[PDB]
Amino acid sequence: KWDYDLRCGEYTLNLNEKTLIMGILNSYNEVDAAVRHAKEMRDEGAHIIDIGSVEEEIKRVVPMIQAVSKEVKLPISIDTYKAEVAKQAIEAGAHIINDIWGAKAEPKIAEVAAHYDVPIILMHNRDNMNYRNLMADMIADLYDSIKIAKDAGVRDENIILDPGIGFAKTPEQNLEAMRNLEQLNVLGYPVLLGTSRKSFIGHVLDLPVEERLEGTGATVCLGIEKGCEFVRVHDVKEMSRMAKMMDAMIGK
Amino acid sequence: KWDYDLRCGEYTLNLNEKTLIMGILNSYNEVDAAVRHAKEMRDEGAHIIDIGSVEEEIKRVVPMIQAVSKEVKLPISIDTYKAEVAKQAIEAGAHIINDIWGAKAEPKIAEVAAHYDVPIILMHNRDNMNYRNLMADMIADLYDSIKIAKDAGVRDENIILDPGIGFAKTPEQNLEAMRNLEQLNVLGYPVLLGTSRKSFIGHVLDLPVEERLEGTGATVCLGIEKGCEFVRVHDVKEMSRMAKMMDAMIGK
Ligand SMILES: C[C@@H](C(=O)O)c1n[nH]c2nc(N)[nH]c(=O)c2c1=O
Numbered sequence A, B: 001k002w003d004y005d006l007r008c009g010e011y012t013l014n015l016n017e018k019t020l021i022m023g024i025l026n027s028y029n030e031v032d033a034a035v036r037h038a039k040e041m042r043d044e045g046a047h048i049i050d051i052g053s054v055e056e057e058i059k060r061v062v063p064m065i066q067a068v069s070k071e072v073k074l075p076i077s078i079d080t081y082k083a084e085v086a087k088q089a090i091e092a093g094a095h096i097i098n099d100i101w102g103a104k105a106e107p108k109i110a111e112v113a114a115h116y117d118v119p120i121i122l123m124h125n126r127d128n129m130n131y132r133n134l135m136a137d138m139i140a141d142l143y144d145s146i147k148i149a150k151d152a153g154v155r156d157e158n159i160i161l162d163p164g165i166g167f168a169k170t171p172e173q174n175l176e177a178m179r180n181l182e183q184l185n186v187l188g189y190p191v192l193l194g195t196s197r198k199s200f201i202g203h204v205l206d207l208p209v210e211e212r213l214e215g216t217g218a219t220v221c222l223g224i225e226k227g228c229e230f231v232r233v234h235d236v237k238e239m240s241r242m243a244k245m246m247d248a249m250i251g252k
């Protein structure tokens, strides 16, 4: 039981009633195609919209946040690691930050987070696979992200963790991170799991990307059962139903 | 780790390498439509074909077992509780018995099992929902099926258990049986979970029977993670992929 609510400016996310679904989002053609998708996702049971060099990243992602935040009543996270991109995106209307490098590629991003008082997702990442002991190094690695974030003024309650499935991990190390996901819980934070349609599901099932829906389901179910608060997925309709059935069962 | 193989006459089922999928099966039109389905199921990753008053039950189910056992190289279980039906069906070519009353409606069925030396599935069932303590009563109830079976000469290794999801249980008691499935393990037997498309998935998701595929997935994943050796499903293709992803993850 979490004794607090995820505070996202306009919207508030309760961490106890259900698994929160974060749906992944793909001029006028671009921004409209994006709005249709957010609306669809919003309608299929999504609770959050995730919207993915420096000059161009802003020119592409800012227009989308303006449009989607205006027409879809749901918190928006900006899928970046660059400090400037993150600032611009929160100004444009993004509620959450989602950094795939856990404040380590550009430490100043954390200072953006503390500044605007927004929730931040620190994902596990690194430039090698040379682990002593996978889980233990992960936990040490994520904790290093927490220290960078805390030193920057980010409040405990605006911190979210993500084990970084599919990053800096071999096919077999990804299964291992899955199998030991509950250990992440000892750190005392909400956990977002992002496994959708990823390579390692292909490697187990020997299936191409468009046929990984049942594989993704598996990983989502396993992760909810191991205590995750969020899941980041492509197939919002399917995964929402799966999440809700899980939640019924574990008694959430 | 099971230190023995499920022995089914012609075929042998290993209990350690993977989750075994049992696929549910629906004159010339009848028996041919049935054969197409078994073949399809066999091709989608099924490991076992499950084939569902006394006079007519034999006339309908015997022809199917003859045909399917001849054209599909996979063990067949007969989904009955009647003693005579079970005998006739094993003569017709059925390898396993699947009793939904756990030897309690017709105790003589167990004697059929001991006689032909075939594996038997004892499912939990009863004519009321008046539980003191759900799980505990289940375990006591199933154990009563084991005592009837053992007294009849059924060998420990030919015994399989099934918690009886959807039987004699309220919507909320079914979620509870799911949430506590691992307790069944203490009895020392293989466990078959059968939740496919059932009413309680409808009650949680508020979805009709043809839209319960993601709900069923959830229950299958939860059950594998809680140590089940079999799952009995309609949607063989989808559930096989889900099972295999689970198995990769739990390290099975
Ligand atoms: C790799 C990419 C993707 O959608 O596959 C991705 N981007 N951002 C991501 N952010 C987080 N927090 N987690 C992810 O798994 C993840 C991704 O998998």
Ligand SMILES: C[C@@H](C(=O)O)c1n[nH]c2nc(N)[nH]c(=O)c2c1=O
Residues within 6 Å of the ligand: B024, B079, B098, B099, B100, B121, B122, B123, B162, B164, B165, B166, B192, B193, B194, B195, B232
């Ligand atoms: C009720 C029916 C069905 O397919 O839904 C059924 N028949 N036989 C069954 N046998 C076993 N061992 N388990 C079941 O859940 C089960 C069923 O659910």
